[PDB]
């Protein structure tokens, strides 16, 4: 009915209905013109000749290790390149934000209401004859069957890129501060109104909660000492709400800022490390500033950890999963003479794409043990029995699963994978190819092109009929990996623009904030600018054990 | 005790304490260096030699009317100048925002908590030996006495620039969508979490309230017809909360989106004009889009009125109060190849400075009548007796009061002016000169330099002792007006940057919003781009009366 159901406008133009059966595309600044913004301006025709595909660019970034070794040690050049990844990537995100679940047209409600996840592509309207607009059958293929046929794990597939459980739980930890779906509202509503990296998962989303978590001496965060070691305080002692099953004794009900991190010892590990680090930085800042009271130590410490997180997140975490020989850099200055919006809103598709469960193994191997999922969940005594050092040691050693490539979602969390498919459809996501187009990628012309193989591809073809009706989420986990990599094209290309904007749009990266005094002077800034995963762990975990995001 | 109490750092550098008795200034990007960022870099030395003073620049803009006639008609040039006014002004604002009443250092709480008005200058620490930092006596002069000696009106002083009551109530209507102090919390807290021009004063701050004001047919806003004429609906009918005194009969309890606009007929006049406008735009959009439902008509109309409001605010209202022969322009394209932040946070000092009560006359002269304040307040039957037409006609005719120049606050609102002094102090505002410096203005060296006259200055010198201890608010209203102007240097130079950021920082001005389809196509866009106070009133008031912000 809606004449815009077919998604007729290309190249980021907007469709608009002009009477019941006619539409009109708005091609403003798209670099194109014509009824569907398909015919290019001249300046544009040149750019599309010279623009290397993402796989070409990927090849260059993951070869010529000798040339990158040299380029990484010329500050001038490293700077030039990073700056081009930042500006080129960010330009793919609409900032200020545009759509949500309920608004396929720009609207003030869409813009002002912070409870919604935003949306890189508008939803498909409710009065469209098919779920993906105009193509395909009236119903998408049974979600249970997509799951079973191409998503569930038969035999574990290790990540060829060497990603380990320190990498896997770090993703889970860090992402769970900006992915917090408000299930009472529905999917496509968020409880993280910071829309970015604010460490509410350490410090709490609300002031009331933050105050319960705080000691009010020396800027510090309450804690308890068990054995010789520092752990987070109890629910009983603090009264902060936490989600624990009823059978959990009150001495193991740990209170951290994210009410869910009790659920997996992996989370609670990072949760403990970051608590120690906040209190660590407090001791440093008190020494530099005997004149400072508790508020200032506390707030400056938080600002410091916000900094460390973005540093660690770019130069270690993204660095590792990217596979690049070029050394990525966290440097706000790169964007000070560039056009850039220091603001962010987390996008449904980003949450959707970040469901990286195939990372998880069959068993969690800590020390001499192999814990099943059943044994591991909601079981913090494991963390206590072995201790942080042994966790970091064992999780550095244990290989994680490959995400793309298909058939590596562990059965233990099949519910979770099916929900991901079902909720995508509930939120009226557009098709895989509409998302590829949106991030400057060649649509897939067949399923065997998508998967790079014959069997999963043939299964998918019997289920969806047309490639243009294939869905994003399943496509991401089934896609052909890059050679010996954990991810395919689509995952990298959608992910990177969401990721770096969330990181660089933070206000501490803005000119007026990025200066020593914001962080308690030059010794405070240094903590940010020398941050790493090794030193985060070294300074906070007994015996400075080796870690990495990578198996050795 | 705080070694930063003296505000030692100059040129926008930040003070930091390094032990109990020593401080350090961080000069990053200030264009200066040294212990107090006083000694200029070379490139800076050149700029301060070529930089005209604001009163020089004011002279050029308000003279040579023959040269401007030509410049206003060369689109190339008008664009170049307006772009320079936008970028040069905006640069004086910190965006993302920095401080509030409770935070004199950068902090995540200051940045994330949208309940606070932000703050162009840090509050004076609580352990400073004096109310301005270190200068003056332990107490500021008795506020009642400052009020009575230099602020209260003896004889009505008309504005020399011709500002009339359409102007005065327009300033009132428009600003009360972003100045909404949360008195329960304290001053320095705001109830407008939009921090800008979102027309909540028309549509309501919350969804719950907005829905009660809506008709849910053709995107329209509920209304009633009394006499022939369209007015806003009642509280009885809609259930929206309004502030009315207990003696107000239910038929006169109009429900608008801002709960206070019941208390002055002037507000309720504009309140009605915009209501009509919103519904006028709905009929137009309905005609262009018979396929459109109620939500989209309603949201698209609101986007258009956000656009009209910014257009009129720049090209008519500011235009008039500026006194420039140069014709200011609303065109978001100007900023598309510029560094600019499409976000805003309204500032205490902006709210403080915008307390323009001297505008108000001794009597409100509608038609053949002269209503006292007591007769006018909370009395909408006056609005009903005369009708919108006679309001517009009479308010176009009646001069408003001069704001600067001293002694023009009408006795009827003396409470308000004293409050204003008291709450500045309560919020720990810095002195007049620290603000002057902060906006690139020569500190006043004497009181008589400030006032331009002897008598008020003498009185001020008896009360405050030192000019560096003079307060901002009083000084704005007692300042030497520009020749035959409503305002002094300090008002214009503080106001203009806060104003143009609020206007241009709105999202509709951003590349991704500013295109016809956002506004329902080319005809929708045209409403924005041809908007003016004359046509806002012509299209919506019986008999297309002439208006202006200026007496004829
Ligand atoms: C033992 C480890 C883990 C368990 C038991 C687990 C389980 C879950 C469950 C039950 C949900 C709820 C979603 C729903 O159905 O509504 C979820 C959400 C999610 N998970 Fe996994 N997960 C694990 C590790 C991970 C890891 C390693 C990643 C890597 C990034 C990840 C990414 C996500 C994301 C992005 C969400 C969405 C969160 C939200 O919407 O708030 N989780 N996890
Ligand atoms: C008959 C006309 C008016 C009356 C009776 C009036 C009265 C007041 C009163 C009683 C307050 C509250 C102050 C406090 O809470 O301590 C106020 C606030 C204010 N007024 Fe006036 N006023 C009038 C016209 C104006 C006009 C023409 C302007 C022009 C801009 C203006 C600007 C302000 C501002 C900016 C505030 C602060 C708003 C806030 O606290 O959020 N008012 N008005
Ligand atoms: C923003 O800050 C205000 C003030 O700091 C917060 O309100 C205070 O809230 C606490 C609850 O933690 C109350 O105990 C105080 O009485 C409040 N003070 C005042 C004067 O309002 C408010 O909660 C914060 N807003 C957000 C969104 O966190
Ligand atoms: C943001 O939007 C949501 C939903 O559109 C608002 O919550 C709705 O609020 C109304 C009341 O105004 C309730 O009747 C609905 O049940 C809510 N729906 C959902 C799914 O939550 C929310 O209040 C809006 N945010 C703001 C700041 O107004
Ligand atoms: C020469 C090697 C350096 C590569 C730097 C760019 C890294 C990411 O480059 C990506 O490539 C794609 C195709 O060109 C574009 O669509 C993305 O926007 C672009 O950011
Ligand atoms: C070509 C003459 C028109 C110049 C337009 C500038 C109008 C306001 O320009 C202002 O001038 C002040 C003094 O230089 C500065 O303090 C402000 O930053 C600047 O925006
Ligand atoms: C009208 C409100 C009371 C003001 C008078 C008492 C405060 C002192 O006001 C006096 O009035 C004269 C004109 O008003 C001036 O010439 C004096 O300098 C002034 O101080
Ligand atoms: O632009 C780049 O190539 C760097 C990069 C930056 C971020 C990511 C990423 C992708 C998905 C999720 C999280 C981060 C990435 F895969 C690569
Ligand atoms: O930059 C300019 O010169 C234009 C200008 C822009 C804004 C204002 C202003 C000042 C005070 C309050 C409201 C607007 C003004 F008086 C002038």
Short mmCIF file of C-alpha atoms and ligand atoms in Angstrom, two decimals, chain A residues 51-54 57 60-61 68 81 84-85 88-89 92 324 439-441 493 497, ligand 5:
data_model
loop_
_atom_site.label_atom_id
_atom_site.label_comp_id
_atom_site.label_asym_id
_atom_site.label_seq_id
_atom_site.Cartn_x
_atom_site.Cartn_y
_atom_site.Cartn_z
CA UNK A 51 37.33 3.79 -4.34
CA UNK A 52 38.87 0.45 -3.33
CA UNK A 53 36.47 -2.23 -2.16
CA UNK A 54 36.51 -3.15 1.57
CA UNK A 57 41.44 -2.39 1.83
CA UNK A 60 46.26 -4.20 2.34
CA UNK A 61 45.73 -3.87 6.14
CA UNK A 68 53.49 -1.46 8.38
CA UNK A 81 46.04 7.09 8.54
CA UNK A 84 41.30 8.80 7.80
CA UNK A 85 39.78 5.70 9.41
CA UNK A 88 35.73 7.96 6.74
CA UNK A 89 34.04 5.56 9.22
CA UNK A 92 28.50 6.43 7.63
CA UNK A 324 45.52 -5.24 11.04
CA UNK A 439 27.24 0.71 4.29
CA UNK A 440 28.59 0.86 0.72
CA UNK A 441 28.73 -2.85 0.06
CA UNK A 493 31.74 -2.91 7.83
CA UNK A 497 31.22 2.89 12.07
C1 LIG C 5 45.44 2.05 2.23
C2 LIG C 5 45.07 1.28 3.48
C3 LIG C 5 44.38 2.16 4.53
C4 LIG C 5 42.86 1.93 4.59
C5 LIG C 5 42.20 3.00 5.46
C6 LIG C 5 40.67 2.90 5.48
C7 LIG C 5 40.14 1.87 6.49
C8 LIG C 5 38.64 1.64 6.35
O1 LIG C 5 38.24 2.01 5.03
C9 LIG C 5 36.94 1.65 4.61
O2 LIG C 5 36.86 1.23 3.24
C10 LIG C 5 35.56 1.18 2.59
C11 LIG C 5 35.82 1.10 1.08
O3 LIG C 5 36.85 2.01 0.64
C12 LIG C 5 34.60 2.34 2.92
O4 LIG C 5 33.22 2.08 2.63
C13 LIG C 5 34.67 2.63 4.39
O5 LIG C 5 33.91 3.77 4.72
C14 LIG C 5 36.11 2.93 4.68
O6 LIG C 5 36.09 3.55 5.96
#
